[PDB]
Design a protein around this ligand. Structure first.
Ligand code: HEM
Ligand code: HEM
Ligand code: HEM
Ligand code: HEM
Lengths: 306, 306, 305, 306, 307, 306
């Protein structure tokens, strides 16, 4: 009965990521938009039926939630936990509202973004805006295929959607966003085979490295987490490349959905704080997190009945 | 589990609407076709996998039903109710069988209709035939995006399909057809802003007017209905533009699917008869209905079991 | 001299529009004729990538005299009616031809709306046809249609007016005929019998060998070798159209050529026959309902008006 | 609950069928591959995330099953039953593993096949390899639309997927393969009308012949089978054209899926051994089977737990 | 027979515009890149051979030409002329090199820009970078179809390519670039009718307004220019929308190609300074130019035969 | 202006290469086909307008020319010259007629090939048949983008088409074909960087190595040839990948067009025999030529006038 947002939807060739903070006194303007967001999506999206694939996923931060609503909160909703590791650091930056906008064409994303921000003008301060674009055969700026091991079907729904563990918010999800910038100069100084050891997959063919060759400090190794019951802990990632050539800015916009933030945070902890066998994730030697925010994306019904 | 026809299927770029009456002694020939209609659909349709999206929905009129079938009747099935309003009239016209044919290309539509009419030749009289075509970004002849607020998924299934309320005809639906002709001269006499107030939405962006600005005699206002439940009463529209430039025919072929004809009929009444708030729908000052028929579209199984 | 899109390939959608000019409508028509190209751009640029919208404007012989003063295209005359022993190629009124093509019907309809909107009260519509592509470039008889159309340089020489009439160089002559087919009769024949009528294999579209091809087949009759060794050629943009209810299953014939003599020779062979053929066998399943001849001038001619 | 392989997925424009036998001492390598087969599918397939439609269905033969797994056997799993008819013979040929690889592009098929064979090198002996291609409007080498009467939706699910009757192997399916070479010289000696009477459908339009003109030895007649219930027994066919012009090879690669092999075998017996009214299937007068193998295609999660 | 750059190439769904100045002592690194620019294009472009449509047009500014080259100069090459009108100004901003990169996908544009800039690092300073995107049915941020009256075929060739009037630079063109930011708030205050009067064409249908009702201060009227002959002066425009929603930036990146800058400059003059009939172009009441540069785009041969 | 065959047309995603020898006494049948080849091309091709992009280039060998035609010979037509290098060897294999068939779909290629061979059956013997397919982003089986430096426009015309040097055959061209099989095992034993030194270009980005890094025995170095005036001698290559996973066949089908064979032969000599600076082409250490034929491809009007 709880109808989820488009959190299970596949990766698209264009995306707009939009993070704002709510100005004091903006609450009411924000509530009005939240109840219209699905309506605005249809209004723009319908024009490009059937190949438009326009979707918007709306997320609300921990502090924003308390300003907007009264009563019970999602069980795991808290501000992004800053991770201060020996070498690398995962910062928390401000963000009350997330708009994850996806389509097969940028114009659709931009048109929807304009409609949303038009209604929010004077109530919100923009914190981050990223226009994501598909890079060749689903590659990131590091030149590796990105998103291969994303869950599908029942597994995707099992890993992503809040269920009976928090029944009042069933159909919701948790999104962690991090804007990463890459040091391409240092990355390109590595041989392809060395880069492969950093990731844990073959560069060209996207084939996973054998369990023999794959280093303990490789990205694939550290982000592979098993639960106490032996099951794999999974997240759904909709990462998109972005960048500016003149500024020498080459980035991955990280976004990860999971039914509990504990799954995503365990992965982050392994990456930044390391394990007993790895000091940290080698990918972080060529990647710097510049933002960090956590949002709860409620069921579609929740926004409607508001 | 009853198998419905393609009544929940989305809008396509081409369409053929075919309305016929059954001649004297034509019952047997019609019964034979009805049992073969799905196979005829596959015979043509499979030639254009996967992008063809050929479908045919077959409807049977109230009078026609009793000539064709012994036993139970669908509970809602009756002849279309003519509405003689103070200024605007919803006419009723003859129609025994409906063929609503859709595909991404007209050739597929035309080929199926050829096979259908081939099998019915000498048993039926053609009443109406319309070839519909997608007009730009899902627009109608009035220049507005048309079909934005159609229900989807669970909401659509609930609004369109017969359920427990008539168990013998579960998976069926009721179709109302009306061929509307538009007075484009008069319409293009109005400013865009004046047009927007007629419809209740913005012309280019298809964004709904604020409730503050939205007139009560706007099309959107009049066709927005709530039951004693307090929930929205919804229909599924597969409207298509048509016309001939030389004959000054600029048309909307209206087709609405609902689980009970009462829903569609209520909307019709509000449009032609008006409420306490409005004398009639302003759209009708630019739209003249020239046909009007009601059909029950059975479950796919029902057709095969003949 | 810039020609019209007369060499453009076949599209998946077309609108054919034939009108007569009402007396006193001369001036309205002239102003439209000067605006037709910018009207095309107005609609077509909206689908700039893959819309492929074009409009070829044709003017009739009688209309030419009423509209313009001075030089006449040499080969411009009314459509010559052919009263054959069995079949007739009728002549019907038509002053203006609008041959509108695009990859989508919406683009065609929009342009036609704009044209007729300007011409309203100055013209009377005679014919309007909405053409659609039928499977793998097939006509209503179920055969691939347009295979032997000239291409490239050969197309240019066959279609475009050259030095023979230098005042109208880059123009062309368009012959239109709406045909209705007897599908009940046609579907009676076996495939092999149908192939003998056309002169090609039905499914594969392979031309029958000269050893097996009947003298009264469409291909044999429409293959014309002129005074020299050169074959005479026309460019056809035939489109299927119809209505299942009215039992209309049609082919809208349009053929472009440098001189109408080429088209007329083929037409005579079809209706009046030759030495070893009474008439084109296709005509036993095909009836012409319209017949008109237009000159389609260079783009610059229409512009400088 | 059980997650099947892409056994229900539709026809694509490119396919690779790979049939191998397992060498002595190659069981270890085969098991290790079978556990990785799904990840290899993703490694190649994610590269063309939209449009790609890369899938691989892995099947295991009877003899191979006993060599490979210790435990319960799928109830219907047995070697292909050779049929020695009075005129036509259905040969049984060796085959331990089936790889049914499909995509919208051959490169994806070839790439995945390379990765699979690269892992299996020196553990398997290749028996058959066929590169299938779509031919015009879903036609076979006989010039007839092929696949028309395939079940879809729920009907497909019930006909193809193993259910409660064999609960330990729920979500599995049975695949029967046969490579056919056609005698095109003989075939193109018949008139179209005569060809139609062999198949049971019109050639150009793919419209089924009426039952009162359809011969009893036509392909459609003999492959139409009803059970004790009175309902139709159905299989899902993904057969693909293939061939080589220089060696006069014009072929149909037959692949049929069913929830029980008894269905496919019944239709094979009728074709080869005939019925009361029909000596054999007239299609075999122009078709020769050179291979014949039967495989069980387990649920996806069965392969993964190795 | 000189080979032009893809200057006559049509509009695409994605573009990158890159404007840089050459630093002191950067001349040799630049000259070296200019010789490999075509080969860099093929290196990236061949990967999407079918429907990629990757192209790069390289332009060189007036001051930069004297620094790079020793021989003759194109006859019409000069710095962008600033226009100080009573109300509106057309600014001249620094820019030595122009890279007009187009494809059907942004990734192709970004891959080529990465290669170009990678070779030019330390030698050049970025001035402007815009990533352009198609907006619906070829619309601009004002919501009007943009490019309709672009010349095609022979007429385009005659309008854009340098010919016999300057035979040593035949197959070249002149490109004028201006980045415009729009005041959407103000624009959306106008009715559709009122907006139509600013532009000179119907909004949705893109049909040109009738001559009797088309205002003298409309965009279409002011940029309609007949020469001394009586024939129309024409330019080829590859305008692309761009913007940032959060920063409230809604822009049109203007680029016009012409065989001589006099054509484009005349149009500019009519827009900014006005005529006897019109004070200025009304579009400028909602559009602010923030960049302005002029470049000569040489024939491909010129760039290759630098070696 | 003599009309050329489609020797200038671009690379397609599908290709069939057909090489046959003319049987004793099959000359008359060959001449009749040659006059109908363009007609056959249109017969199949027109069915798939406008995306089909079907074309067929017909070539005639040296020895075959003398059997077929009386009168003048193309100036540069001769048998393929075997190259017996110190290490590698370019074999000469029999070939009278080349059919180079390309389209966006294999079906069109296969259909045309069928028609051609159907007419030549009993008059010719097949020597070679390859079905080519596009591999990812125009890559070859070595994993490098293949065809990057092909000339285009006027440059291609001057490089490929016979001109005034041989007036009677203007519009014609010369095709050299070589079927190469690759040793993939060995090639994948090299690092990416080593592979780059073999080819002379970066692997993923396809950017050419600078002159101070590019080895003299690299493929790009050895196939770069300057002529008398100092301008590069160029060929047009339409290389297509092919292969069979079962038989470990991973191949490049090499075809090169040039206005004179001298150009293609110089490159071949440099590759196989070597220079003072280069023992041989390093690509040959991973590539074996198994066929080798030279053909003249006449202007189109030459074929029809027969
Ligand atoms: C009744 C409507 C007509 C139909 C259904 C029809 C159909 C066909 C077909 C199926 C072909 C063979 C495929 C092709 O090359 O296009 C063909 C060829 C041709 N038709 Fe028609 N046609 C019609 C009317 C006409 C008329 C009126 C003319 C002449 C004025 C004409 C001239 C030709 C020519 C010149 C060819 C090519 C013959 C060759 O050189 O091989 N057709 N037509
Ligand atoms: C020689 C290779 C074969 C060819 C060329 C062939 C071709 C066809 C064609 C053209 C049809 C009609 C279109 C359709 O419904 O798919 C058809 C139907 C069918 N074929 Fe085959 N077939 C072959 C082998 C087989 C075999 C071996 C089986 C069974 C094991 C089989 C089972 C069926 C079934 C069940 C149908 C559907 C019949 C109906 O219910 O109407 N086919 N086949
Ligand atoms: C402020 C940014 C601008 C916008 C949004 C804009 C938009 C438009 C629009 C909507 C049209 C009508 C449709 C068309 O034919 O393309 C147009 C026409 C035109 N614009 Fe602009 N324009 C801008 C700036 C300029 C500038 C700076 C120039 C000259 C340097 C220019 C030259 C033209 C020309 C020559 C035409 C065609 C006029 C005709 O002959 O019909 N535009 N522009
Ligand atoms: C063994 C099979 C071959 C493979 C896999 C192969 C592959 C390649 C590759 C990857 C390139 C660089 C990208 C490009 O510009 O296309 C290339 C370039 C080239 N190849 Fe080959 N090649 C083969 C055989 C040949 C042969 C036999 C010739 C001539 C007889 C040849 C002539 C050329 C030429 C002229 C170039 C362009 C060099 C330049 O100017 O940069 N190739 N080839």
């Amino acid at each position: 009965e709880p109808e989820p947002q488009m959190v299970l939807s596949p990766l698209t060739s264009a995306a707009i990521f939009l993070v704002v903070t709510i100005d004091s006194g903006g609450e009411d303007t924000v509530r009005d938009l939240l109840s219209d967001v699905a309506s605005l999506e249809r209004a723009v999206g319908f024009r490009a039926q059937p190949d438009g694939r326009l979707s918007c996923v709306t997320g609300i931060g921990s502090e924003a939630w308390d300003r907007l609503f009264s009563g019970a909160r999602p069980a795991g909703l808290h501000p992004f936990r800053e991770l201060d590791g020996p070498v690398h650091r995962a910062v928390a930056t401000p963000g009350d509202l997330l708009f994850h906008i996806r389509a097969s064409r940028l114009d659709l994303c931009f048109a929807l973004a304009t409609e949303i921000m038009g209604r929010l003008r004077g109530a919100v301060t923009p914190q981050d805006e990223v226009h994501g674009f598909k890079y060749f055969d689903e590659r990131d700026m590091l030149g590796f295929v990105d998103g291969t091991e994303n869950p599908t079907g029942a597994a995707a729904r099992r890993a992503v959607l809040v269920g009976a563990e928090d029944p009042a918010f069933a159909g919701g999800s948790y999104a962690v966003v991090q804007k990463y910038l890459h040091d391409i100069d240092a990355w390109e100084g590595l041989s392809v085979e060395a880069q492969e050891r950093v990731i844990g997959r073959r560069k060209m063919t996207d084939v996973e490295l054998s369990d023999d060759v794959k280093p303990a400090d490789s990205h694939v190794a550290l982000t592979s987490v098993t639960g106490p019951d032996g099951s794999d802990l999974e997240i759904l990632r909709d990462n998109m490349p972005f960048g500016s050539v003149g500024r020498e800015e080459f980035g991955t916009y990280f976004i990860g959905y999971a039914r509990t933030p504990e799954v995503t945070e365990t992965m982050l902890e392994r990456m930044f704080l390391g394990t007993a066998s790895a000091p940290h994730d080698r990918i972080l030697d060529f990647s710097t997190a510049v933002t960090g925010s956590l949002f709860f994306t409620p069921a579609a019904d929740f926004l409607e009945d508001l």
